[PDB]
Paper text:
However, intestinal bacterial GUSs cleave the attached glucuronic acid for use as a carbon source, allowing potentially toxic compounds to re-enter the enterohepatic circulation. However, microflora-encoding β-glucuronidases (GUSs) are notorious for reversing the glucuronidation to release SN-38 in the intestinal lumen and thus represent the major cause of undesirable effects. GUS contains a deep enzyme active site (the two catalytic glutamates lie ~12 Å below the protein surface). To understand the underlying structural basis, we prepared C6-propyl, -hexyl, and -nonyl UIFGs (2–4, respectively) and resolved the eight X-ray crystal structures of 1–4 bound to EcGUS or Bifidobacterium dentium GUS (BdGUS).
Uronic isofagomine (UIFG, 1) potently inhibits both mammalian and bacterial GUSs, owing to ionic interactions between the protonated ring nitrogen and the two catalytic glutamates. Inhibitor 1 appeared to be potent for both human and bacterial GUSs (e.g., Ki = 180 nM for HsGUS, 16 nM for EcGUS, 7.4 nM for BdGUS, 6.5 nM for CpGUS). Isothermal titration calorimetry was used to measure the thermodynamics of the binding of 1 or 2 to EcGUS and BdGUS. The potent inhibition of 1 was contributed mainly by enthalpy (ΔH = –10.47 and –9.12 kcal mol−1 for BdGUS and EcGUS, respectively).
Residue numbers in the entry:
A (entry chain D): 0 to 228, 231 to 365, 368 to 597
B (entry chain B): 0 to 601
Amino acid sequence: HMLRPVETPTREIKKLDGLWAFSLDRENCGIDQRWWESALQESRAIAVPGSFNDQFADADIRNYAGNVWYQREVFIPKGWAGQRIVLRFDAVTHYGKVWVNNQEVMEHQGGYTPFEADVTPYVIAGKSVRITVCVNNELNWQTIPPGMVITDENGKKKQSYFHDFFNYAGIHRSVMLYTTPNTWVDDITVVTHVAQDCNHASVDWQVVANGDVSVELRDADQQVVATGQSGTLQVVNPHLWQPGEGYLYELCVTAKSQTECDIYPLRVGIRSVAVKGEQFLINHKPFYFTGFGRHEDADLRGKGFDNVLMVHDHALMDWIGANSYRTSHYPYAEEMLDWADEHGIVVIDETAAVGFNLSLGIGFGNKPKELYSEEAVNGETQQAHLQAIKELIARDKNHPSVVMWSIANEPDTRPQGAREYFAPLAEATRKLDPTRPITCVNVMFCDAHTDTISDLFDVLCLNRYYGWYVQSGDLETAEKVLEKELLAWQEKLHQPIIITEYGVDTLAGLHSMYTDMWSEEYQCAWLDMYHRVFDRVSAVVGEQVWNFADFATSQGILRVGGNKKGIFTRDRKPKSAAFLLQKRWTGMNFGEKP
Amino acid sequence: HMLRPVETPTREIKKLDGLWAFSLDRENCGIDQRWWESALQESRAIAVPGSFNDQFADADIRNYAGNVWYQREVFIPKGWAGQRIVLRFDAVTHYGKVWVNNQEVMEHQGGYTPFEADVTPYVIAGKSVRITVCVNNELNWQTIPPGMVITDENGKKKQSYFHDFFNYAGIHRSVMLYTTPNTWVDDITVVTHVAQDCNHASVDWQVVANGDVSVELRDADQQVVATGQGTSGTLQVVNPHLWQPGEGYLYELCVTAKSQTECDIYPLRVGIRSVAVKGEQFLINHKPFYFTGFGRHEDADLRGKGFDNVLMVHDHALMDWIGANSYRTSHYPYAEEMLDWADEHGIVVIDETAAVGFNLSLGIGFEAGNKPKELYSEEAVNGETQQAHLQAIKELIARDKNHPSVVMWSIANEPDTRPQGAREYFAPLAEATRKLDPTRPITCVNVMFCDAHTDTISDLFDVLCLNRYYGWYVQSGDLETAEKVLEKELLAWQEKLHQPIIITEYGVDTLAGLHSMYTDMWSEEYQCAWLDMYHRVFDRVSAVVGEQVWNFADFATSQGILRVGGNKKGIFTRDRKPKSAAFLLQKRWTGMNFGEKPQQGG
Ligand SMILES: O=C(O)[C@H]1CNC[C@@H](O)[C@@H]1O
Ligand SMILES: O=C(O)[C@H]1CNC[C@@H](O)[C@@H]1O
């Protein structure tokens, strides 16, 4: 059960003061000596939220593998006596264990979604409370994403993994205490059915075993459009949420007990999404995706959320004419999807299940020789995977801006076990939520004649790098390979085709008369050639450029101080292909394919 | 009366949530049609804290001159019934006017120090209250810093100013509502006297509004070491753990404000430390100290001068790594988080007002008009510029009075002191500052072309602060001639004043990546040679007790043929990557013993 806390007759004290106390645990004796009982000795100030890696300009902290300890004091507001008090972490990347003054509150494996707990019997209103959080950043074969910790014969752990971005960790998002009465709306699901945009229904389902519920549908002018009294349904008149506007009704659910009362406001976007034939229909009209795969990657904070960075990246995506993006390779911060709700941005929401593939040269030992096996990606990783889809859906269900779930990124689907693995996951997800199409984004070398699993999904998502990783430098042959491959998919599946990734590394400042790789002239010619090919194949309904910005990776001979396929630098300065994308994307009609 | 909000039987609701509503006012009718009365129209989301300029990647918001509108709703807690509620803005840059549901509560001009208002009579506990703020970013001759707003024929205003950083504006630090009981400690002043490091007296004086006071002084182990009574006139005798550069041991002063019915307790951090200028030495706890480090800026990539916690932790990691022990709040007061950090980690800090650009002889700044023909006149820098300047000195001292890390007040930065009337202006504010805070030495930072033969006002101050660029702006490229000019100038300054000499700005513009076998201007090799030549001169002049490299990091300036996308004299880049010179400084500042002048050897 998860909703984003709001303020009303429910309160919140945001505890991301910044400046917790922080210390490594190189000897792995924190839990044994129970460091949560006292103040951490030999600690230093750390900023919350933000990754602990890049915060101290220290190579030993940055590449650290083990447990790290956060700690902070905080006075509980005296006006909270007799309320339910919830300690919420919006994200603790990979693993957290929480103590409130010698008492353990909660522990969570899965570093991108919230976890909260009821802390009433362990705090008294008005006195100071100590919170210790033991964060762990290790990946093994049953974490999402997977990884492999290797120890030397001397005892220092080095982490290996199989995805392209760097393995930042720490407290990445909001820690907050929020209160609620002891009669409290705990969960609301709303499904919205449309059919020629003139009168449509909002089925309701909501759970609070603590009180009886009234529901009342407000509009943007705070005037009531419908009312009902769990398992509700309301019928309404026309003004849909559309990728242009993003008109949001606001549905206040009241939970009445005789003694107490609780009001929770949930914003509803009224619209439909459905795949038919080769079309991706938003409110029964075909839609053409444009935009980026992104990353939560910033200069000094790592993957730490930041409001200024959010406003400025959306100013850039607005200027460049993108209507859509994909939360590439892990669930994003919540405010991202709240912003897309208000501004009508289409989002592909995606689980952290990346790196199920031992055949890439990206992302940092001796790896197992068959991927699907006990040794790696066994039954326990399948259920850990499924738990990640449950948590992601449970968090983002009501968001209108999420038009599609992506259960995994670039899995190796050639060995079997790939289908024996992904078939139950696609079916569990489809029943967890049937209001949105389902996809799995497919890696390049699993071409149309080789991949095993994409007929279990609704939309086909392709990451193609012809002219980069294969046919390197030759736009002409890469053109012909590209335009032979997507026609091959179209005949095979007759599904909508989104190219969720296409991009080439580009050094900001490298200019060439010869249009060769790494130069800005090549990123321009490359993107345009992919565009010529997209426009001639009817089945492609979306383009998303690989990354919007340069981002940090693990060290390697293939990554010049990071992944450089950005349209913008890590500084968010535009490479000269930003004006290529702005000109094409804003010249087209909104949401419609050239 | 100014105090840092703390949480001890007192509560705060940080309204920094960012994502306020934001709107410009190009027709300048927001005051006319009463924009605070309803929700801002055609607004957009803005992050707070943070300058508004670089946030939307649009030049016409960036160079906007006029009023900006922020707006936000906030639910006010039920359990603050019998409590006093205060709305506080730790910085609204330049001018800010606030409305609490159609009622103006506050108004402030001064972009870098906090202002607050008591909001109890217009707030209902439990109901949502809407907060509208009108911010202005204009500078005239009686603002600090000064400037000239230039109207074209169509009413579009362009701001010209005379300082070398961009004029970022908006709500730059943290906006909060906090409580207090209706009996409350409103101001504390603490002075600490040192007598050869064995026993000392902490003069206390407190202005509680509404109660008798006891004080209690606790150590780092929270054990009581001294008690006292009375609204003031508390002086406590210790056998102490001094606040030292390097460690920064902080006692704790618990001030009790007890009335008949209510109670209020405020914990103020107290560093036991004495600062004194004796001879050509700057003594901290009666020992000669050598400053190393930086002039800084509150400047980052997309938040402008917006405060940020990751950025503060990382920059202190770097300043600790490179061996710096000091810095100067270059050109405006910094956030209090910065000076609280310096208090904890024993970092020596020169505090500075915003009085920069009292000089119309520099190519620095924005030149979008015609500058006045005389700086010290009724048209520019008049008696009201002097009162605004005094006001800025009082607010600055009123906030940082008890920070042990502050060792000096900087009244102004590089004023032009050749014209008569520079002393008619600066003498009264120098004595008024000494009457505001007589426990810390006083300085004014001296511009390069006011040499020892020409400067008129430096004898009014305790420490001589120099900004020199020989071999850059003059004798360009010529290291061997520059060495002679610099050593001649520094020996002249010492002989004329016999004050301590801190070089608060020396640096050269340096493109990261530009390398040269000829050690040319703008190359990383030049930066290195230039810094090291300056260092050989310093080490030969006894009166020099400090070196502060001009900037820690590259920062944004206004457009001009002298500023390649900003000022590039940083040791680090804007995204905090080290230039070659960073390893030069690290070898010097970590090779010296801590806090002591290199004896011309190694
Ligand atoms: O090679 C690339 O740049 C991309 C290929 N597909 C997956 C991405 O994580 C990766 O970054
Ligand atoms: O020109 C420079 O680089 C510096 C000269 N002295 C004043 C500073 O504000 C300025 O940044």
